[PDB]
Amino acid sequence: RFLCGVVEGFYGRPWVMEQRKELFRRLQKWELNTYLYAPKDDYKHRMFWREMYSVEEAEQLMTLISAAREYEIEFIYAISPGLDITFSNPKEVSTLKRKLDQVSQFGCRSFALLFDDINMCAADKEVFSSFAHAQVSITNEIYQYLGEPETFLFCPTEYCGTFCYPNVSQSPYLRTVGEKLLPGIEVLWTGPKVVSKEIPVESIEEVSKIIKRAPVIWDNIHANDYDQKRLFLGPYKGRSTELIPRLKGVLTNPNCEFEANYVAIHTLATWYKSNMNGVRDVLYSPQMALKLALTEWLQEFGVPHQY
Amino acid sequence: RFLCGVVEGFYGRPWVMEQRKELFRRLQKWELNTYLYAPKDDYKHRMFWREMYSVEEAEQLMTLISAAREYEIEFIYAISPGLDITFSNPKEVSTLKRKLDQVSQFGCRSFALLFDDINMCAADKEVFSSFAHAQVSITNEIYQYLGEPETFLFCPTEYCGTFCYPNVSQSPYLRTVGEKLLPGIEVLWTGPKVVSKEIPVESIEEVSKIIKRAPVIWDNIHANDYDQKRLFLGPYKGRSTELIPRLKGVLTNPNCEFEANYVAIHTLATWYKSNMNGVRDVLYSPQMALKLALTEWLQEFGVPHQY
Amino acid sequence: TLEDLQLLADLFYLPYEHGPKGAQMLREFQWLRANKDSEKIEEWRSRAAKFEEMCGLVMGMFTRLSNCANRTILYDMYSYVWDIKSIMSMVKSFVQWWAFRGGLAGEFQRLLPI
Amino acid sequence: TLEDLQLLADLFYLPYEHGPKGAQMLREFQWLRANSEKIEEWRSRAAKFEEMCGLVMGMFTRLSNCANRTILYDMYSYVWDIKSIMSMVKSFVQWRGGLAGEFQRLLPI
């Protein structure tokens, strides 16, 4: 029912396979259940999405998906074709079909299409009455091609309140997304702003009305890729436990530095467990969640681990 | 005996062992002879200089020195205690000996001490007459302790004209280095500025007179760690061939990205070879060396290599 | 090709110097920007269509480079190619015509002289 | 110790909020900055902040000697940047873009 876990979606150096396996172990341990593969600087995911994997790459992706399954974790493989795809080109759709087919042969079942941080090209202006339509048409063709996978995610260009033109409720793009996009495909949402201070319960009910469904949060609360001098070791804060019966999931995009995400993922698990069975803060305090996380963290520091 | 090669002495993600071995393959192939291990962001070189190596790290460092020796490449190991060493403290000096002892147990026979981007503490005020005396004293004690290695390098604080207080010829700091630093220890110089546009013959005559020796050039011409949007694929330029009979060596600190450094190393090899047998630009044309370096590089792009 | 690398090198040349081809394009764009009455409209669109031909060559070279057999060289420098590819789109297309940084350390630094 | 990670988490808290211990130091420092019988107060407050600046270095160095180098190596770069700044704050109390840039700079923005 609920997709709660981590999204490796930051700009910067992507985590190694050793760290990813370790993350799945922590996720299972803390009763979390999902992982979204979205590293912006892994060329095969974004910049060079058309590029197929090599024998070696295929082998580790196979080990990682195997590891993911072993720890009862949902591995969601994402691709960001948005920076240069020709939506109307049948070769571009065939490339996305071949690339996601190779990944399904690795053990992947759950996929995602991301269309964030991306003017239309003449050829697509003929064929498509808008961007929202072009993205939805390609997303729906892939979802059906992939045999309607249970877990399929869609990230809109307008993914936070601030990005909606003119506003959230009146946005023609979100209207189009909610209307024309298949009901079996999930929509990602990062709240009022990219890095939302708070995520009001009124804020997401307003979105659920235009996208005609409950969204999955892509939380950038612990994200630190936007500033070299900043690190976030604080607790999960600003998102009420009342939000859980109103969402299909929460996936936190945390700090680039893997080992600094202990509290980030710890407090989130405490938050998800404090109200996993609800009605469509009373149950959780970040102050108390922070103390519990640092207490568990502290012991780890004393355990010898060599670089 | 002239030291020509590459110094990996930049800020950023240090190179992997695989890349470092391939570098030795390239240096030998192009008739170059040296490699100075100085990654500024390798915690056990700068920041955590006191920290000894673990088995796995010792094993890796062993294989690398073995590989250098195998490709007729001199492996010079650098260490920067500058940011927080207490020069008067016998525990600090003992720590610098323990680590260089452990490093020589890995097959390393050549070493370096850098005191470059480093304000004296009370105890070094009592014990040391000046800053230049502090470094010189600890450097000479270590060199002698290490049984006077044939290749011992030292990087001064004033490593370029621009860093010299008041000037190059009248610097009390350099005066002390040239006078009190043992004649068998070499001094690194980057030229008139940190990234010198040109390195005039006259400028080196001036430095050599104060340091009482011909320096080893630490070249920052292809260094790109100061700007995220800059890359240097141009040729080794601005340093006359007339310089070779006036230096003990040339170590280029190139781009952070290993594969971009083909032209930087290729053109440096051509410049060295053009006047490898000195006297006291007619012999070298950056324009020509670039024509050859690209012709040779272009064949590498066609060779299949998976990431 | 060789002429492909010559151009590539000229765009990412030296710290105090751009390559010949790099300096050429820069000199021309500066000129196009700085330029019935007189027939010097003939030279502007001739020189502007020649530049939109040079923006098309440089970008054909970029796509070519991305299709190289050696993905190891490419994955190390393409991030730099990708940026100049974007900045030559808007250059051609032109001619055709956080926020409270540093965290606690930074906040403490604002209350310090230097 | 727990009180150390509680201090560590307070200085690298959340994007729009610094932790209590971090917020207190900044506030107390903004106070010392704005002041020159009543001298005894500033003097006692300058001496107590100086002790605060000295305890945080002590936690910083303690952390640097942790058994878990794997955790340490990921975040000590941040710790080293606030330690450099904690020191001169205390000492204060005691007291281009390339060819792409060349092109983008000539474009309307």
UniProtKB/Swiss-Prot annotation, chains A, B:
A protein binds at residues 9, 40, 116-117, 159, 225, 253. Belongs to the glycosyl hydrolase 84 family. It comes from the Eukaryota. The lineage of its organism: Eukaryota, Metazoa, Chordata, Craniata, Vertebrata. Residues 2-276 form the GH84 domain. Ubiquitous. Shows highest expression in the brain, placenta and pancreas. Changing residue 117 to A: Nearly abolishes enzyme activity. Monomer. Interacts with CLOCK. Changing residue 116 to A: Nearly abolishes enzyme activity. The active site is at 117 (proton donor). This is Protein O-GlcNAcase. The gene is OGA. Proteolytically cleaved by caspase-3 during apoptosis. The fragments interact with each other; cleavage does not decrease enzyme activity. The chain holds residues 59 to 397 of 916 of the full protein. Changing residue 11 to K/Q: Strongly reduces affinity for glycopeptide substrates. Nearly abolishes enzyme activity.
